[PDB]
């Protein structure tokens, strides 16, 4: 298992524009297009991102290229974030992947605000951070996904994903 396979399980794959769970336009593998209620806005963003007139539809290859860019961007955002970097640097390979997932999903800013949980992770207080992370809108809105990530952090293994 790796970060790509992991996020691919969590986000899924959709070749047409769709509304993600917060009602925002998305496509591919969790690629947020716009927060804006306009389909036009989303289509526009889509064509800009792909480099062509898409008519809200992309190919698999195109999905993946966006995915690759997004993973890369998530890792780089963590490495430049003064609050995330030190946490990331203290973790083992599996748990770094769980931090990348959250960043991918909620952005650098959202994650850096989990002040208390970050500190517990940094301190390797697995069980306590897992409980702290659960006390969030994040967990209440997307519980099954949040639970897979939380377990990852808690156990440091990919058990939450083997079967999926």
Min dist CB 143 to Cl ion, Å, is 5
C-beta closer to Cl ion: residue 95 or 145 = 145
Min dist CB 142 to Cl ion, Å, is 4
C-beta closer to Cl ion: residue 29 or 87 = 29
C-beta closer to Cl ion: residue 136 or 142 = 142
Q: Which of 143, 145, 119 is nearest to 132 (CA)?
A: 119
For Cl ion, the binding residues (CB under 5 A) are: 49, 142, 144-145
Min dist CB 155 to Cl ion, Å, is 19
């Amino acid at each position: 298992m790796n970060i790509f396979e992991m996020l691919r399980i969590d986000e899924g794959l959709r070749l047409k524009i769709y509304k993600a769970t917060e009602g925002y336009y998305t496509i591919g593998i969790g690629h947020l297009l716009t927060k804006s209620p306009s389909l036009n806005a989303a289509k526009s963003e889509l064509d800009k991102a792909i480099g062509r007139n898409t008519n809200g539809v992309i190919t698999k290859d195109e999905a993946e290229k966006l995915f690759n860019q997004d993973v890369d961007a998530a890792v780089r955002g963590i490495l430049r974030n003064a609050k995330l970097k030190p946490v990331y640097d203290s973790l083992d390979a599996v748990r770094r992947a769980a931090l990348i997932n959250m960043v991918f999903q909620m952005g650098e800013t959202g994650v850096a605000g989990f002040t208390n949980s970050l500190r517990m992770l940094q301190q390797k207080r697995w069980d306590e951070a897992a409980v702290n992370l659960a006390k969030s809108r994040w967990y209440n809105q997307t519980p099954n996904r949040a639970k897979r990530v939380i377990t990852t952090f808690r156990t440091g293994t990919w058990d939450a994903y083997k079967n999926l």
